[PDB]
Design a protein around this ligand. Structure first.
Ligand SMILES: *[C@@H]1O[C@H](CO[C@@H]2O[C@@H](C)[C@@H](O)[C@@H](O)[C@@H]2O)[C@@H](O[C@@H]2O[C@H](CO)[C@@H](O)[C@H](O)[C@H]2NC(C)=O)[C@H](O)[C@H]1NC(C)=O
Ligand SMILES: *[C@@H]1O[C@H](CO)[C@@H](O[C@@H]2O[C@H](CO)[C@@H](O)[C@H](O)[C@H]2NC(C)=O)[C@H](O)[C@H]1NC(C)=O
Lengths: 410, 398
């Protein structure tokens, strides 16, 4: 559940830092990756469940009947009954409009309509609108509530179990049934310019999605439109028409396992944007501050070194202190999952959080009493230590969804 | 390995929040200079002696009104309303006596009082008494709770944020703080080793106190005991015998200004902080409250935004039977092995110390169980919202 961006190779070719040029913050953006080509497409991503999208009304219909019985003689025998009937769509529409405008009034029983030697009755068709909220299957695109026939419905005039009432969505806009709000989003595809385009050789980026492995990306239809679910369980829209390397992009992806679910794009949340922005400025300024320590010829701590590390995958540089000397090394950072901020063995899972653990770094340098690695990785008696800030959780994987999944109150 | 600030008790006395007070705690701490020498001295504090909870009663007054409308003709139109009003002291006294004796019964709605060509109504003055506990000022013994106007009260009758409710303490003795046996507390002092130690070069901290700037810390006698008063209004004992850097510590600090009051409320201070972490934390808290007011669904992470991230007197939050609930507590420094734990344990004394249970009362939270400030008890372990960690001595060397 804990991920880091770390140099792929367990050993790097180190050289002493001389020119002192600052790459803050460290990322693949600074370095031109030759074989890489990028292409973007307009997309859409779910940013949260808005329950009002499934607000409804129970349209009840019942004839109120005043019956006058006048036989041979005797008093005027008047009875009052009520007969539940199923409303037409027109009845429900008119009565709902009346309800919204505040016109709908329960007028009660009809006035007595009497004759002689004949029992005739007069009736008032009474509609009662009881606001009822129902759920939504975003995946199958229909309403869902126990009151429905079959426990579900996909119309604008749904039939309930009770003969008297039906259900009308408060929004009858003839579009997709969805309990989810979206936002437009440019999604960018990165792939090897030379090789043939394929799901495994694609990486997705967006303002909300950091280096998302197409190889662990599957196809899924959400809220009535085609898209792809990323390895972190988040989803962006993608139509069959969109081409990448002059080929249909969508069919490159395996359909998602039946019953696959999709989460709201966490990074679009305001709390998340605040945290992100503050972290951005802090990463930058802490990097610059470390390089200021270097400039002032001050000694460097492992933490200071870690402020130079790349926090995202990409071609970059790593830094360490070999024999009291600041050294850099070219490398390609990749995403790895580690077992904790402090580890027993210098291993990590390289393909997925449930993948196989492999040696991630083995080239340790004499750093005082202990050994040090790239970007202030510590080899100590208490184990192997990463600085907590290099570690991420609950963003690039679905391992901690329980923590960020929102639930209503009361 | 990861320092956090967590309620010192494995269980707390939870109350609902429908009041909407919008309390946000002061944010986390920032980096300190890594080359700092640390020397700790033994001290003491009422924190631990003084009770943390105080039982009382909300006295709510409401007029139950049955209204009869009889105009020109037509049926008898009867309506039923309820008007919240502020109770008198007499109303509260009588109703509280009735409550204690078990006499107090809600009279429901008054019987219909009808006339003709005149809409007249009959009303019942229903006073309701509800047991309701509040926090306590550790140093003054005052009552501390968001319910109170100004957050605190020390009177026999207490005004609340509810204009119709009045809080009444069950025991109006307020104890005797000074007489108590003050809890022993270790106070850590950080200073520049390569300088002559001075007030302006000192940072205090303890399991109870986030970083306190010595430059704003003054000598102040409290309950007859010599001591020092942190900028947050709290106080710890310190006599002249205590040496730091082979030198008298206490005389390094000026006397407290005329009539300095040592307090311990929820706040303890008006313009926005300029500290980036504090601004962030504040913004996140407020974001969660925005969610609450908009009646939007809440994640455990959102909940965590409401928590204090530094040691100090504060509130913890949780969700009990779908009700957003809060409790008074003290946040204390602890150390946690990581965000996901096999046992709900943490280190209370030192990162090199031992683990102990830190949370016990779990509330059903769907298929999971939730604790304070978003702490989840799940099949896959005990999961802390990563916010609570926020920002090891091996990492800071050479
Ligand atoms: C939460 O409270 C419930 C009781 O209230 C329930 O939820 C309300 C919203 C309302 O709908 C009530 O009608 C519900 O019953 C506790 O459940 C029971 O509590 C009573 C009283 O203590 C007890 O007799 C039952 O045995 C409880 N049920 C069981 C088997 O535990 C429940 O304990 C509370 N939940 C937690 C985790 O504190
Ligand atoms: C709430 O607080 C004050 C009292 O502290 C209220 O003052 C009166 O409250 C009664 C309640 O029955 C009202 O009927 C009166 O109209 C109020 N009087 C006046 C002129 O203030 C007040 O309702 C609320 N806040 C204020 C100060 O307006």
């Amino acid at each position: 559940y804990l991920s880091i961006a770390f140099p792929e190779n367990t050993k790097l070719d180190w050289k002493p830092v001389t020119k002192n040029t600052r790459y803050c913050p460290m990322g693949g953006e600074w370095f031109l990756e030759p074989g890489l080509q990028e292409e973007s497409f307009l997309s859409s991503t779910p940013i949260g469940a808005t329950p009002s999208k499934s607000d409804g009304f129970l349209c009840h219909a019942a004839k109120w009947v005043t019956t006058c019985d006048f036989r041979w003689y005797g008093p005027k025998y008047i009875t009052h009954s009520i007969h539940n009937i199923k409303p037409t769509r027109s009845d429900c529409d008119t009565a709902l409009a009346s309800y919204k405008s505040g016109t709908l009034v329960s007028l009660g029983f009809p006035p007595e309509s009497c004759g002689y030697a004949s029992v005739t009755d007069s009736e008032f068709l009474v509609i009662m609108i009881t606001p009822h909220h129902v759920g939504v299957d975003d995946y199958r695109g229909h309403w869902v509530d126990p009151l429905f026939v079959g426990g579900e419905c996909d119309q604008s005039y749904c039939d309930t179990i009770h003969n008297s009432s039906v259900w009308i969505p408060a929004d009858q806009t003839k579009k997709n049934i969805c309990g989810q709000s979206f936002t437009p989003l440019t999604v960018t595809v990165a792939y090897d310019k030379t090789k043939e385009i394929a799901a495994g050789g694609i990486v997705f980026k967006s303002k909300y999605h950091s280096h998302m492995e197409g190889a662990r990306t599957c196809r899924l239809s959400y809220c009535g439109r085609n898209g792809i679910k990323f390895p972190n369980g988040e989803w962006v829209s993608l139509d069959v028409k969109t081409r990448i390397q002059e080929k249909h992009l969508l069919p490159l992806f395996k359909e998602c396992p039946a019953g696959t679910e999709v989460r709201s794009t966490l990074q679009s949340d305001g709390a998340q944007v605040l945290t992100s922005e503050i972290q951005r400025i802090l990463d930058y300024s802490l990097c610059q501050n470390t390089w200021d320590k270097v400039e002032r010829k001050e000694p460097l701590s492992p933490l200071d070194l870690s402020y130079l590390a790349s926090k995202s995958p990409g071609k970059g540089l790593a830094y360490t202190v070999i024999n009291g000397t600041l050294s850099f090394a070219h490398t390609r950072y990749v995403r790895m999952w580690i077992d904790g901020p402090v580890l027993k063995e210098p291993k990590g899972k390289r393909e997925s959080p449930s993948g196989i653990s492999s040696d991630i770094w083995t080239q340790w340098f004499k750093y005082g009493d202990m050994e040090i690695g790239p970007n202030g990785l510590l080899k100590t008696a208490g184990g192997y230590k990463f600085p907590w800030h290099l570690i991420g959780m609950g963003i690039v994987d679905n391992e901690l969804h329980e923590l960020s999944e929102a639930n209503p109150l009361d």
